[PDB]
Design a protein around this ligand. Sequence first.
Ligand SMILES: NC(=O)c1ccc[n+]([C@@H]2O[C@H](COP(=O)([O-])OP(=O)(O)OC[C@H]3O[C@@H](n4cnc5c(N)ncnc54)[C@H](OP(=O)(O)O)[C@@H]3O)[C@@H](O)[C@H]2O)c1
Ligand SMILES: NC(=O)c1ccc[n+]([C@@H]2O[C@H](COP(=O)([O-])OP(=O)(O)OC[C@H]3O[C@@H](n4cnc5c(N)ncnc54)[C@H](OP(=O)(O)O)[C@@H]3O)[C@@H](O)[C@H]2O)c1
Ligand SMILES: Clc1ccc(C2(c3nnc4c(C5CC5)cccn34)CC2)cc1
Ligand SMILES: Clc1ccc(C2(c3nnc4c(C5CC5)cccn34)CC2)cc1
Lengths: 263, 279
Amino acid sequence: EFRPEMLQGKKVIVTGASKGIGREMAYHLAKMGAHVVVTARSKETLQKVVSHCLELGAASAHYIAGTMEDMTFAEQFVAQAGKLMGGLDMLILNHITNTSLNLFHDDIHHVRKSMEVNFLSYVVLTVAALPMLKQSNGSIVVVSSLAGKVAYPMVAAYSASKFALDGFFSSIRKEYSVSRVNVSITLCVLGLIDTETAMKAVSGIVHMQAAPKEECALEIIKGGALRQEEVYYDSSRWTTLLIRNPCRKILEELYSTSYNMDR
Amino acid sequence: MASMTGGQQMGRGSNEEFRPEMLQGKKVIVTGASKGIGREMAYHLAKMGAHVVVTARSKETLQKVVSHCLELGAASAHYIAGTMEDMTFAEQFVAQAGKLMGGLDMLILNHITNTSLNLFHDDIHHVRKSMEVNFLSYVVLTVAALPMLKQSNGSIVVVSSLAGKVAYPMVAAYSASKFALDGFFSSIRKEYSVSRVNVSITLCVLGLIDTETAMKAVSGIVHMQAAPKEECALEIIKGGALRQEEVYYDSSRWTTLLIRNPCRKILEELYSTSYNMDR
Ligand SMILES: NC(=O)c1ccc[n+]([C@@H]2O[C@H](COP(=O)([O-])OP(=O)(O)OC[C@H]3O[C@@H](n4cnc5c(N)ncnc54)[C@H](OP(=O)(O)O)[C@@H]3O)[C@@H](O)[C@H]2O)c1
Ligand SMILES: NC(=O)c1ccc[n+]([C@@H]2O[C@H](COP(=O)([O-])OP(=O)(O)OC[C@H]3O[C@@H](n4cnc5c(N)ncnc54)[C@H](OP(=O)(O)O)[C@@H]3O)[C@@H](O)[C@H]2O)c1
Ligand SMILES: Clc1ccc(C2(c3nnc4c(C5CC5)cccn34)CC2)cc1
Ligand SMILES: Clc1ccc(C2(c3nnc4c(C5CC5)cccn34)CC2)cc1
């Protein structure tokens, strides 16, 4: 059972924190009295989030503006965020490249950019953050979608990148377990959320109930704090009932006796 | 006689029971067909009397596969050597292959970058290369092949792994790329359905296979029973011919029982009604 005091004085990074779910997470963490370093490209919007974080009661609040298309920025950002806070307890990976609901035709540039920003930068951020997270027995929080677990039309490139996060981070979770790296990994599987971006994107195309961004942001933080492997958040009782894959976990365990990693 | 001949091999029960004659005279591309499962698929297709265009980097190894395909009874057999790290090669290969056969019925996406079983530390170059070769090139080959496949009401065959459905340690990069194939190709399958593009997509979920590469990779690290490459290759072709959405092939009779996700399919079918794609 979660308590807001679990985040009191914790050193947290939040990516894609200038708006939407990312901004809501920064605000929640501020209220809990955490140290926060927020990122996104817009320096001006990050300034207002930092200012409001300090008002809400953050132990400290900083921003570092830049693009996650730049893997050098991604790497340097973590070192700089760690130096400002004097360490790192939680890494919240939330940013995505701009997308829309459209049929896929021939836009390989959007497929590549989606893999680079939505996936490869998450791997770069993890590599850069792991020494500090190993020191604190910290947490990695990976923001995904229902579209990163089941198939949906009109989001092929996006779905690929979210599926890749599951493949990558679920594999290293098993590796951390055997190599006794006490860094938890939480994959957050979210349904439709009432962010400005999502509401504009689904308008007249998707007829679904949207869940509130404030509660969504809190459920992500809760999962991270509780070191839960996965978080499932959706407005529908039918979605939450069916989204889980109990057989996958059973399968992985039956195959867990087939390895020797003493090398 | 060919000008005086006509008809269809795909009638009653052809959606369920496979016959080697379903591939007779079919125009098939096989990527990563110089060795392993890919080579076995080329050999099976040759025996079925299909037209084949095989690819890999090694011109010398592709020459031997082509020669043996012609011996086995392929209607035609050609090779185009190159690297799938080059997206210009991937695009141009499909056009050149289509010209050699006078069209395309089946696109078999099987190649992968060289990988090993290792714990992930900091090799971002291997994560990028895995995404580029195992995933992005598959998308480039699909884009280049789709006009010909639409013309023939063809098939796309995507070779994946159990590691592209469940998590395994020591294959983080590899698994990331195989999971991405599922996300990408399962989404466009739903798109093809609404936009009435009659091109089937088969995702093949394979367990450990007795290929030289896999046997060397797992040596002293992974102790699992390996399935035969010859039978594996045939099951992939069968799934493609039958237009099955997924193929599950593993040594364990139990894996086949658990690997399927009925909940995913139901969730997708319930969310299908929530759209408006009249735009
Ligand atoms: N909202 C939903 O319905 C929904 C559903 C499922 C999953 N999710 C997941 O929830 C997360 C947040 O979504 P959201 O709706 O809150 O999105 P959002 O409001 O559009 O915010 C996206 C954030 O990413 C940043 N960003 C965009 N391009 C970037 C780049 N190249 N480099 C660095 N940062 C970049 C944006 O800031 P700048 O443009 O200033 O950089 C912004 O802060 C995502 O991971 C998404 O997959 C959302
Ligand atoms: N074997 C298993 O245990 C296993 C298990 C599950 C799934 N699978 C899947 O089965 C498929 C085939 O695996 P396999 O074990 O049969 O592989 P394999 O015998 O090692 O063959 C890989 C093929 O890809 C080619 N290739 C390598 N790098 C390439 C590049 N840069 N550009 C173009 N072609 C390239 C190789 O030829 P060149 O080196 O001459 O280029 C070769 O023909 C893969 O998709 C694999 O993930 C295999
Ligand atoms: Cl057709 C369809 C596609 C995707 C979705 C869902 C979804 N996942 N990410 C998003 C975004 C991201 C912020 C961009 C915007 C809108 C919906 N999203 C799972 C809820 C619902 C329906
Ligand atoms: Cl630990 C572990 C990781 C992966 C696997 C499986 C697997 N998938 N692709 C491969 C390869 C490809 C030629 C590289 C080599 C060896 C095993 N592979 C599912 C059987 C089993 C155990």
